[PDB]
Ligand binder design. Structure first.
Ligand code: MG
Ligand code: MG
Lengths: 404, 418
């Protein structure tokens, strides 16, 4: 029986040139697993030494993995995810994971699962999903325009496979780029890729729809729009000053005027009464995704569900801090007819965990960025590999991704 | 002794959302290796595309993928993956073209690299150890980091920092990241453009080419490093792009070879420029001769497009006293073996060697292991944002931490033009 014989972390850089950590968990069988961590929610631990990386170092977090965390886990069976995650959550001691750092905990949480997977000669998605499953290729939501709303996205719902979904997106991305250049508009990319041109949020959807049709896809069927209002950042809502109801009104408008299939954080995370009506109104017309309002926290999601808030949840591993807790959120969401979107973070790494995770959980949806930057594209390539490995038994979710 | 029992390629996406290939080589031991192929943006080996206008705008690589899975796989079944030269020779012979235009340099390179990884993994060694051998010698290369892009206002293509003065690669990386963040902060505070180009560099609008280096110098100082000591500058002029017979489109003007040389010279005296890449066109050998005569002792003169990682062309360059360093791009020539010959010829002739990425990259980190294994001492692998780039730096971090003392950071010893 393989047991954990060593855990080691070191400091690496994320896709925004900010430090993060990478963890390797080594087993007695000599098999090992590696994982890196992407960039209210659980507390990531930074060094705040202003003479080093502008205070964003993660040396202390690395110390916690290599010392305290390591000692408390030596000898453990890596297959016992829940218990290992329990030992760490207890060791931290805080609701926050503020002592050891959510980044330190998650790094090892993930590396342990990779270790167990590798020891059994299984790809992560297989180790997590069963033998078993069921598996499905998730529908990707692709951040194409940014915001002088935070994200304007395309969603290749109508593709027959993930490989085709990917191609649909790439061809729209290229079509859009050619337009921006022709209009003398900005065509360089932000953190997740994606262009940041524009006079009035609306005109963003206009460019996109042009792009979709330029590439010979139908905005009704082949490809939809999605958006991330990130309204928490606009809150008693900032081009004008709108009340919650006037905010909902516009959302309702756009949903009618455009093929919007999903809306993220339409209202503020501090506006639960607003979310109630928004949901009441559109819960059957569009996907209403809670991000900041839920922060991948199962207790908060539970309260959201009881109180009729949203109809989908954005799942961010490092917002909660452990694999076990993340799977609980996913399971709770699925139990209650809520959509599940496995999500990247702004500061990503070459780590492709969310790809396997979306497949193994049959989440059916993934948000992992625009179509340039390997911080994003590596995730799509991993999904290419998985689809080609599972073939027929990982059908592309398509329309079936959306439950509303 | 394990032999190749399978080769399989498939079509993935590169960091610019264009298709490329990834290849897995499987051995009888059940060990396997994988590699992916990058893509750039004249004499270089032929990257094979599909040209099917209704698919990825004609940029598919299904044919290259088929070439790997069919004829290449057939030719290589039962070969010992450790025999890299023979394996590359077989593919070169099978293609039968000077250009690799038949099978595709992308199909050939993908297999060539995956074979190396398979052998490495069979021996249970990291690639840098497999390639460099047990004893090495190893070194951590000095990175040149493209921080401001051009060629959107700016004529020159790449304005880079080079942290020659750091004590370790880990510190070199920190130096660069802090200058990168200092620069971004300046651009933002001044309402200038903060979005990035292909390699993750800022692409602001500036009154003139120089202003890019002036901004970079400010940023180096904001981060409290000393220009010309801790951190130097390097330039990719990519002048082949500015060359229309028989002058160079510089600052809304039209320069002779010697005027361009004079400009490059001014910059060398005014700023701590340690390296200039493609200062003149690949079709201006006469100019290169003069450029080299004048600056070869004062600055590194990197040939990129003029040599295209081709040992036969570098030899010609050497005989004609052209340049004093070569930019090494695997996929410009097409096999690991021919790439290593170029590196070897460069070293035997005291040319600098810079292992390089392409504009279109993948999560593949081969060039990191390659630069350490060949004791190249220099690497050019992009700005400090975008994992297509940062993944290479992180790989260098892993390697330094594994070698710890057997891989000293090259620092000043990377530059031998003196
Ligand atoms: Mg969000
Ligand atoms: Mg160049």
């Amino acid at each position: 029986t393989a047991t954990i014989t060593d855990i080691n972390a070191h400091e690496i850089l994320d896709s925004r040139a900010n430090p993060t950590l990478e963890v390797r968990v080594t087993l007695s069988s000599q098999a090992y697993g590696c994982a890196a961590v992407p960039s209210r929610e659980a507390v990531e631990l930074r060094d705040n030494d202003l003479e080093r990386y502008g205070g964003k170092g993660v040396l202390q977090a690395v110390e916690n993995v290599n010392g305290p965390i390591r000692d408390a886990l030596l000898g453990q069976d890596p297959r016992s995810q829940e218990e290992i995650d329990r030992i760490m959550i207890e060791l931290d001691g805080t609701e926050n994971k503020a002592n050891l750092g959510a980044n330190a905990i998650l790094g090892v949480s993930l590396a342990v699962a990779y270790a167990a997977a590798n020891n059994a000669d299984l790809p992560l998605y297989r180790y997590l999903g069963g033998d078993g499953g069921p598996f499905s290729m998730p529908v990707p939501m692709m951040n194409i325009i940014n915001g002088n709303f935070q994200e304007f996205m395309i969603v290749p719902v109508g593709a027959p496979t993930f490989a085709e979904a990917l191609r649909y997106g790439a061809e729209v991305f290229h079509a859009l780029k050619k337009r921006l250049v022709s209009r003398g508009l900005m065509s360089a990319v932000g953190d997740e890729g994606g262009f940041a041109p524009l006079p009035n949020n609306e005109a963003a959807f206009e460019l996109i729809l042009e792009a979709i049709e330029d590439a010979n896809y139908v905005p009704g069927k082949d490809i939809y729009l999605a958006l991330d209002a990130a309204s928490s950042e606009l809150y008693g809502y900032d081009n004008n000053q709108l009340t919650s109801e006037e905010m909902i009104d516009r959302l309702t408008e756009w949903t009618k005027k455009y093929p919007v299939i999903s809306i993220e954080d339409g209202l503020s995370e501090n506006d639960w009464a607003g979310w109630k009506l928004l949901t009441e109104r559109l819960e059957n017309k569009v996907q209403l995704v809670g991000d900041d309002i839920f922060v991948t926290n199962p207790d908060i999601l539970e309260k959201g569900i009881k109180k009729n808030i949203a109809n989908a949840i954005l799942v961010k591993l490092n917002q909660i801090g452990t694999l076990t807790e993340t799977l609980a959120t996913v399971g709770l969401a699925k139990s209650n007819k809520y959509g599940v979107i496995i999500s990247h973070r702004s500061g990503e790494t070459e780590d492709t965990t969310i790809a396997d995770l979306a497949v193994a959980t049959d989440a059916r949806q993934i948000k992992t960025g625009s179509l340039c930057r390997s911080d994003r594209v590596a995730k799509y390539n991993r999904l290419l590999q998985i689809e080609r490995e599972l073939n027929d038994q990982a059908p592309y979710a398509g329309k079936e991704a959306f439950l509303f």
